[model samples]
Target: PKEPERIVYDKERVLQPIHNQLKGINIENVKIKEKEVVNATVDELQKMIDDGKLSYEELTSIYLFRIQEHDQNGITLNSVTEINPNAMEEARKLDQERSRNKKSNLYGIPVVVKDNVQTAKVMPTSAGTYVLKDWIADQDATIVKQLKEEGAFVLGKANMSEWANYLSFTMPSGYSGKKGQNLNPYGPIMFDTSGSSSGSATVVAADFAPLAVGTETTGSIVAPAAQQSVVGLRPSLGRVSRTGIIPLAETLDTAGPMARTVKDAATLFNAMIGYDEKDVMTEKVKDKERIDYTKDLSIDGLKGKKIGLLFSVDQQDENRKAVAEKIRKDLQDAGAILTDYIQLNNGGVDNLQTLEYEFKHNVNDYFSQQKNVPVKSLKEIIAFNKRDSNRRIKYGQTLIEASEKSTITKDEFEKVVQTSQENAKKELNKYLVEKGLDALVMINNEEVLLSAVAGYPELAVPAGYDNNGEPVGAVFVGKQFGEKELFNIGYAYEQQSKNRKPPKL
Candidate 1:
């Protein structure tokens, strides 16, 4: 069903050096001194494990060492909230269970999960809120469980924006009542670190973990990935089950994968997907089979493919435009055909009232299922914050208060969903079908909101750095359930560009 493909390797950018992050074990002498981790891929690590050059415990210990040296003390990135106390034990068991035939790329590898996604241990699914700081879940999220079943180690919980940046208008991007603020490692404290997947993006960008899971309602995944210079993939809505994830408008919410390389992101994305019975959204794809995400990756995967280029109206923003020009040339040089005439409109983002309504209804339902949570509803949460105004009133909790007044009837909810879907689908189809494009590309987070509202797949791949040395991404919007195709195109472009570089922490 496709053309022949071959890989064109780059000599300089293959496996560069610096510090890195994951793994846990005890009482081990130096089996291996220093292995290169910066710019390392999941496939590369797996090969090391298969060749007996490294043990699973050593890998976990090395990552833990990096986290200790950089994340916890030296640079103080503050991206990780809590390290898994049982991680070392888990790694030891996986190492013992290994045999001649190896498992998938993620097997025995470590993953730093976002705090919004539940884990059934010392780490609480806080969503970066003080109210849920000590509230541990009795079960793991479906993605967590699937990863565990594949022998993937749970490294730690990554910090995120308070309530996934839904608390108030004045709330900072990576600030939380529990973990304070997450700083960008590339630049000073003033450098922008987008959210609500703040830690997910920054942690992976700083090499805290080989992979991370990030959830998005709108631009939570795409925007932060662009800001941090990581490969972020937002699968089609309902592609990955969100059974245990904290709610942020279930209508537009979905969990995605973030990693340094397109292949690593696809590897993690493949393991996180499967229909879960608890989540109503997953019922739509229960009959569908899982797609092998990394199978289509190749340096020539972009050959003969069609792509639409979307440009912003802000002619003054020459910073991203310079990088965008390079992206256009790189994609063309890789033998991809581009139609550079698509313009994205903000019509799809007009209705945010839907999220406010959905937040109230879904969060209440989510709280009701909890066994011993302190705050049972949004009303209680607001009251708790008001009681402790000094600590909790960072931004006045205006968004939560507004959501407290939200009310939606069954008929009203249906109408709102229909209107949003109609608008987003209309916007996307204008370029996707009319222009006969395989996917659409743009710099930064310009047109990704359309994919979020449209419930389609989107990806953010690092393009180049801006004038300020901050990174930027070339985003790709794909068809519904078009994750494999997106990965193919992204992998090809990523190999061609290799624009991502390790932070100088």
Candidate 2:
């Protein structure tokens, strides 16, 4: 049976013409596609402003125009859910201040926020689902507030895996009921977009924005960053506040910066971290002093650094294993000491049962703050999906149902969290501490599970493309709050290799 063209266009309407609602309200049409803006760094854009060669409004216009031409029209990456309604006005105001005020690396810059992140009531923090499509958040997430303090404005909320890909195990990584499928601009529409952070990663890779804030429970950041060929930095669990962002599992959930370069991601990461009273997890870093992450970056930063290589026999494919030698060669040439393929003790740590229990409580806690959302709990969301099962349940809500059915006592939940963390800590410490390694390197996101369970930091940087013409990433797994070491190593690898290329229009 064929669907009517009207319904087809309704799905198209979500991704395409995302800026249509912003049309005429802002500039009628402004010139875009400046050679300076394409793949430019946040620092470079700021310099362009200082030299009188660019304005905040100009940077915003270029990004918005690309969202129209590339995301909505050309290859139809369909990444953004909606452009920020007041972005133009915000940019104009920032331009006035830029001429008179001291600046930071992100001053007057534009950035994209993943949809799960709560922002001003202009857009809903939908998590790419219809159940909460109208649930507008009353305040910006703490990270967003920090970005505002740095003179950066939200350009848009990126489309993402519905419920951050937590709704169903059968669902595809980048598909969402609200906005349809988000395609990778680099290749065929069927190319894997990785997981929940697909849209956030896609926009940065496609040049819709210089920086995007993406979250990760496990591979949400690293997986998409690997496939989409962007630099994704997953900070230590307590490094950034989780308030105002919808939670998956508080134990492992974190938000970090995604960009085309290590320095740019570092710049965004510096501003995004601060103690938030509402998020208790940030207490871990309350006593820690902050530093400029970019200061650790040097073209020769990898020299004399001790790096360990991890080859997960169960996870890496033949191709990924082959890429390991290439990456090892790159590291060696950069003057880093590399270990031969090493293995972690099989701790068999499974967090699914723990995650299911956490989701049931976390989702309800997040929804309780919503003013008018009909589905306010995990059970309600499951029932809501049942009402429109055929259309909304395109891939069955197995995960959502499992989470709703989860049963665990508070005592049991505490043991689960502690046991899993200890096991992972022991596994990682055995290797990292004994070897005196600066970081453990893998092909792409192979370290996500172990890193997630242990509450460590992980960085994903693009390696060269494979035979499939798809991207690969050189992942760095670090000790807790070891983001600076990862940045130093990633910056050296990226500066020398520089394998990333902009998606073709």
Candidate 3:
């Protein structure tokens, strides 16, 4: 039979069991319409649930149906890696609790998390690698636990760049050995999706889930969010706990929310932030009062704010340059004071060296915490790749090899880290203090590295689309722990511009 002629099909065909199970949930008396659940905000969904117009089972089924319709079959986005088997059951339990007047901002809301974040027995925390494909986490990540406590259902794990884009230099964003490539919801072109948080961004943009959690070491969160024309908040380094998250760099890896609106991002952040004794970073802010991030949202957030506009016409294409100009005008029109054309010089800091040194150490620490893992150290991972090059090493592991070969001593590494942090903070403050600016605005990906290295907060929001119909984003950068102010600015601009449009798929 000549091996029966291999047949290739979309993965959704295998997920028919999930569709069948969800179809069994009873929703005959539900008052909310199906379209009302589609593309609805978190607040809108909560309202429907509270008003008895929607049941938790109906809400969960709607998202699962959409995932099957668009993500898995319609456009083959392949963003969601797995569906939670207990999601419908959990939603039923929440509905029972709602009968007694128990409610939360995330009540019955569905959220997707990146594959690297552990989700206990629901799914394996594979980090999109085959080495730990069979390893299931023994416990939920801290943020996941927090979300569950607030009545949110874990929809599934999202596909992510293999090893968070640290395994190979040439690997395309959103490509995983276990799940394959994740397509941009906007279109299926061959451009980079700007990972390593690509799937989280894509799922939210495609409306598979109203919100997703993405972790960033540098441009991971901002780049993908900007590319997808959604709001991505990379909170200050210590604001969110890092426990149970696979690390890219201990100093820079922080998880945050990616959503269609700033208010939704703030809602997720409110539930995720708290003091966790397991992560030392969270200890620093333990004594500080926790504030509801969504409390002060305003459309006049940009009024009277001093914003520094940073850009160079030579550095951007004509389309981008025009977009940059329009962003400046938008700021002015929103009542912000703009200091245009400001430039800063890099103080000779090598960010790559810092990340390389940190990656080897942090990844080893992460592996040491896990059991039944094939590779326990960076050296073993390199050897494992060599052992199975045909299956794993599609692109050369230049980055992994570089990290393996790095001879950065403890003293040298400490000095480089201190110097880099000092330089980034000094440079940013020099401009802000001298110009008396409240925040700095730049095109997305322009200041992500600097802000990430400096441990500052950055918010990326949709500015407009390019001539190619791809999205462009404007980023708001602020001082350390300045997420609240950045949120206000981003929300105001998002409201006034209203540039995001769902893909025509």
Candidate 4:
């Protein structure tokens, strides 16, 4: 069978108009001398600030301009579905304030958000559905509110898997029927950039935004981050508030940062992790967050760290082993003490049976709460898809149908859930805590399951690519609230490997 034809574009010529519009934004330090600004990371922009060459407004303007230029045009990354018109004005205010008291950690940084997150702005919170196209959230979600308080500029909202890929099993990620498919900026072939968090990963990876937020019920964030060669940090459940985020499954829904670097993810996570009065779950967080994660990074961080390496389940083919080798070498190079043969035997395929049942019930309840929505239950969504021939004809909602039929009250449900969670927890306690190890490393998915797995606070760092030039990544999972240690380890490893490079379009 013939594979899908590759789609590629030369964005420079097509995007010049938008680029010129950004130059017209009149940012004082935008260096018109530079020929291109494709893969510049947060650190590189910070250097300009340290040298007194760039101001917060300049950085913020550049981000806004770049998003307009490339995301909307040129590459037509389509990663961003909406731009926060108030963003520039907000940055202006911050710049004026910074002139008085100096800047904060993220005083003028621009951020992209997954469309599912509600915001009190012109941008609608549709979650890739036409039903909520006019649903302007009454207020910013908890994290968005916090981000604003920290002086982070809201660049816009990125397109996502509609309902976080809960709409159907056959729904292509980042390809919302509402927004159309978001293209992978790099293309030998327009590879799957993974789902749900597609826009979040794309904007940051393409330098449209310095940082972006993505939520995951499962592999949504990590998979896209890996495929796009960006850093995705899936903080443990409840670490970040889910007050206004559209939910698929409440038990597993989590929002985290996707950025070009580990430090950026850490910095953003700090701003995002705090108690939210609206989300009752926030009260359950045991410790008070410091609101600054970069404080935890250490250059010589990985020495003596122990990581459990996992090989995927049934799909363990040649590609899986080859990708694992790079992560193994990365761990060794970072001075991480090796614990080579430690696989969590329980995390295999059978582990997902219970999770699937939970997903159905949880998702059904979540949809029932939406205001002015047409579909109110998982069953309703399934029916809606079937009725709408245009949407359902090509890809049926078989996953949803299957999930809906599964008995939600089976005795096996609790048993399996308990078994899987306990198994992961026990392994961490025994191998890392009891043995004084720092963290664990593994592939988020097997070679065949390229969609990646969800949960478990995965920090997906780039691990070069396959012979065909498709990107690969290694997931470093840490203990609960152990993100600080994980960041340090990932940072040092990233510094050593430097596997991430700008995509060649």
Candidate 5:
């Protein structure tokens, strides 16, 4: 069998526009200071460009330089899989447009996306798999188009868990055959850069870019961002379109922003939220009034709010319990009414039949639409893995094999889906209404699975570090389409806690 042809992208051509603009310029002669650019938020970056203190070309060049210095050369986190071949040219165009006084929240901002999201001709949407190594998207994902409409540049593609961590349970997070393993900047020796959005979160933690987009089927975004001490928002399923993103499970998958601050996440969310004709799930958001998510941000957003504490951790884990206690105290100090010991009736929810069934159906649907790709069906993918020696060296494709053999009928599948939906909603709503709670909070990645299953929105914010300096996070979850409320409550807690710290790379 013939292997997929590798597509070579020219780095010099990609950076030529910026290079020409900075011809004969010394590194120190750049107007925007390195530290300022590294730590700046989306709003700050836009303001700098508006004030003529920085140009999009220069700011983008700085990020490219950082990627080369730290990501590829210095510590070698191996986070970025491929740089966009047209980013510099796009930045130059934005610079020229900014001169005419046009502006948007994400205008002139650089964003890195997980490799699973489609970026058309700029880079291959390989999903970190060797089988689809040179597979280029015929069109951008709906979310990518929205980002471009808001004047943001696709800086690069961040490496992710191969097949979004669905291949094997034993495989380490952030381990992809194409790009190798991505290391966590904080406590790299012991701490795992939890995937499948490992590189997305790692890049933000390393300040390689102001923001990155990560997809979540379960803990893909939440775990990675929490372990890295960055802010990640997993919006309600229908709030963001899944069109053009490689699917793990269509029912639970969503693309979201991973950023250094809640404000930046909110800014990215504003651009991403809208109904798309391409994705039927987004119909839920139709007829909804458009509002800026950033407007609800306030330090006093948590005041007088009733918050329920869900203890999702094992009592035997004293360190985790202590972290939860600290988060509870922080919420209390922030003037939230805390209700303790709220638990969900999660019985019968541990089954994986629905996901396995959906994975085959959804992935086949996606592959069927692609122009040029290897293995359009799950069965074909399983065969491809068997023929390729490198695919199973670290871990066999147990999950993929199970999915390929799935014989779930529609009647049985619909029953499981309905049961999950009703039970999750019933349990969550009963707890909230009975307790008179505005939102539910949990420690670490505990809320990821539940919220994802329920199709509810969740905001994961930095809580604090553990004894060994590894990061932990607190999650805020709300009913479906309740992103605004969650953002407000999360913002208040984040402002009071101030627990996020840049990693020493």
Candidate 6:
């Protein structure tokens, strides 16, 4: 009998055992309504636990059941790529400890990780590619290690664009040879769930997981979150460690939190962020202050904020222009100062060239790190497809071959990657700081024409719809670590429009 092979472990073996351990913990004796408090925010969840309404094992069990029933059957989002076989057993032990007064906010919170992130459990870290389908890291990634330390339940690995959309130009964004295709939650075919982190976005949008992690070399995180109408936070390059994540561009690559709200992103970021000796850049981020992004989320947070509408970028598409207009109108109506047309004098269209060179370098470095995995090198990956019958049936690895030909140290390559990044940063900062603008607003994706590019802190709020009735999202971007202001603006706009409707699928 043919069936979609079971990528995750059975809930009865792992999750139920944990619930049995907490069976004696009465939820009612502590005061508040048990059911009502179960859906509270992370902080509120902590308070509920402190008041004894729920146990960590209990919360993990709830999500586990929900994923098994709703995601696998009712909704069929196809978001989860893999699941940790030991998650339930580990959570049970942590719950028992919590009963003795030891606790962590994420002690039971179920988190879905992008397939690119390496988890040393029973789950494989393959970046949704056939090449590494059976490859398992010997150790957990830095972020994964942090999550485990906090007692967070590792729900599973989320499906992503096969090789993070680096294999072929014609390949669809969310297809993975390992788990098949991931559907957009917004109505199946109504729109593409922006590329790369497609599964992460779909799962979060459909509530498969309260929090999911996504990596971005470019628009991977922000684009999908915007398309799905969820909160996508892209921290600075070194803000979150990238030691074991499947890399797209080391200079540009960074992992961040994707969730339904900014507060969720903040909570995940707080848990996952720290210094890792493996990645040198992460060492610099040690001095960087850790921020609880939720502390400042409020409508009044945008009271004195000055936001700039990026008319230059928005002008490229009429739909994007319309979305920007709607956002400006909403901000004005909300009593916050806003502006249109912030010019980028130092930056032009030169940034694209820089990314290509960096992409080549980063991809090479990433491949080098996969020491014992199949198709360990980029050349082997291309050759592996040629040797396999089904692998080359749909798409050709043209990009891998092209990248193999590019040289990182070429004089022209050096200028573009080095100078262009500086130019883009300078131009963006000049307008934001000199003009006293708190953030820059533009279309997160090209109104159906999705392109992969490195993104900053992007807060995408559903603006309205285009002529086709597909949802359009407006993005608020800012300089490095500018999430605080961007979140405030997004929160206000989100409050006014309230356009984040769950996907029809």
Q: Which has the greatest lDDT?
A: 2
Model 3 CA deviation exceeding 4 Å by range: 1-17, 23-32, 312-316
Per-residue lDDT for 1-505 in model 1, tens only?
1111111111111011112223213424322423455557888877776787777777767666666666656766777776776676777888888774257778888898888888885568889887887788978889999998777878887878888888887777877776667777777374767888888887788877889999888888888888888999888888899888889788888999999999999999988999887887877778889888888788998998899888642452776667877888898999999885677777635446877788888899998998877878999999889888867756679888888886656677768688778888888888787767889987777676678878989999999898888888888999888888899999999999899998888
* Stretch of 10 with least lDDT, candidate 5: 1-10
Q: In terms of TM-score, how similar is model 6 to the real structure?
A: 0.83
Q: Which stretches of candidate 2 lie over 4 Å from their true place?
A: 1-33, 312-322
lDDT score for residue 327 of model 1? 84
| Cα lDDT of model 3 by residue, 416-503, tens digit | 8888888888888877766678888878787776778788888889888877777888878877788888898898888878888887
Clashing pairs in 2: none
**lDDT at 117 for candidate 1?**
85
Sort by TM-score, top down from the best: 2, 3, 5, 1, 4, 6
Clashing pairs in 1: 22-63, 23-60, 23-61, 24-60
- Residues 1-505 of candidate 4 have per-residue lDDT tens digits of 1122222122342234345436556544454512234466666766766677666666656666656556665556767676665665666777678756545566678888898888884567877654565567666788988887776867778877666776555666676644656667665235776778988988888877789999876678878888888999888666789987877656567899999899888988878888877666666674665646787677668777777665542445565556667777877887888775665544532334655686677656655665555556667666666677574423445565777887656687766555555655665667667977677666644321211222346688887776666778777777777677789888888887888888753
Candidate 6 segments exceeding 4 Å error: 1-40, 44-54, 99-104, 311-326, 343-364, 407-411, 446-456, 464-469
Cα RMSD for predicted model 1: 8.0
- lDDT agreement of model 5 with the native: 0.80
Per-model TM-score on C-alpha atoms:
0.91, 0.93, 0.93, 0.84, 0.92, 0.83
Residue 175 of candidate 4: its Cα lDDT?
63
User: Any idea what lDDT model 3 has?
Assistant: 0.79
Kindly report which residue stretches of model 5 are placed more than 4 angstroms away from their true locations once superposed. Answer: 1-25, 30-32, 312-318, 391-393
Model 6, C-alpha of 345: deviation from truth (Å): 6.9
